Amino acid sequence: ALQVANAIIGHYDCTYGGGAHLSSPLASIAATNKLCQSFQTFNICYADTGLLGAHFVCDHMSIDDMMFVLQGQWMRLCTSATESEVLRG
Amino acid sequence: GRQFGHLTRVRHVITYSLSPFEQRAFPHYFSKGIPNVLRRTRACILRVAPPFVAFYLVYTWGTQEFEKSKRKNPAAYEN
């Protein structure tokens, strides 16, 4: 389920075709507002523990916006996930 | 105003930090705090305290003279 959620959020890179239309809200907002140069979600697993989150690369004046959006998406999924996005994930 | 991201240039400093939910809010409140206040007290008494005892001394004297001079007084008028 964590990976399914992570797929929904996706990843992004400034060489992706089509940005504004991307499914992931993080991805599309990042592409339209140039908040990012890249970002990716991840689920590192180790025995009985692991790292679950995201890493991103950006300009000095966009870290605050990138975090706001990244965090809005986790929250949104926690409390508000819809059905078709889960299917896509 | 000024915004984070445009303040100034800093190179080479690492800051390590903990989550509040991971640490104590009062660790050695007394063990380390008391000593600390004693130390800040020592560091400043010589500059803060003296002018005030100077006022204190003038405060007690000044009122003392006032009472003895006027009221208490009527000293000698002897005939």
Side-chain angles (χ1 to χ4, degrees):
Chain A
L2 279 169
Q3 290 284 195
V4 161
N6 271 181
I8 300 194
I9 305 256
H11 39 288
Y12 168 85
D13 189 71
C14 70
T15 61
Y16 281 16
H21 308 130
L22 285 168
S23 292
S24 171
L26 179 51
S28 112
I29 292 173
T32 43
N33 291 132
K34 306 169 187 291
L35 294 178
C36 201
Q37 200 75 101
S38 91
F39 80 73
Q40 81 245 167
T41 51
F42 62 68
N43 170 152
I44 325 267
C45 303
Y46 292 119
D48 299 291
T49 189
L51 292 171
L52 187 292
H55 144 97
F56 65 76
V57 176
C58 71
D59 177 76
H60 76 110
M61 306 299 299
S62 303
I63 317 191
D64 188 53
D65 291 324
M66 260 312 279
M67 198 95 234
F68 178 73
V69 193
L70 162 64
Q71 282 188 314
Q73 293 301 114
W74 288 333
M75 290 312 84
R76 202 209 75 222
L77 285 172
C78 276
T79 60
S80 210
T82 81
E83 222 72 43
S84 32
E85 63 189 353
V86 171
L87 207 213
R88 160 177 102 256
Chain B
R2 29 226 315 269
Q3 339 161 23
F4 282 107
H6 281 123
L7 301 173
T8 196
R9 172 184 198 64
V10 188
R11 290 252 247 168
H12 316 303
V13 9
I14 306 179
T15 300
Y16 304 90
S17 51
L18 263 189
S19 166
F21 297 91
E22 206 90 52
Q23 46 186 316
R24 295 171 198 220
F26 301 100
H28 310 86
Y29 199 67
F30 307 114
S31 335
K32 274 159 174 278
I34 303 172
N36 281 318
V37 12
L38 294 199
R39 179 205 66 80
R40 301 152 69 180
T41 301
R42 300 184 188 136
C44 76
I45 10 179
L46 277 323
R47 9 264 177 136
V48 178
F52 293 124
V53 345
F55 152 85
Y56 175 151
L57 304 191
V58 177
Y59 165 73
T60 43
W61 181 84
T63 55
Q64 217 37 238
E65 168 66 342
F66 173 64
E67 292 197 340
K68 301 307 121 59
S69 165
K70 189 188 293 177
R71 339 162 159 181
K72 252 321 142 223
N73 230 274
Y77 39 95
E78 294 178 350
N79 300 300

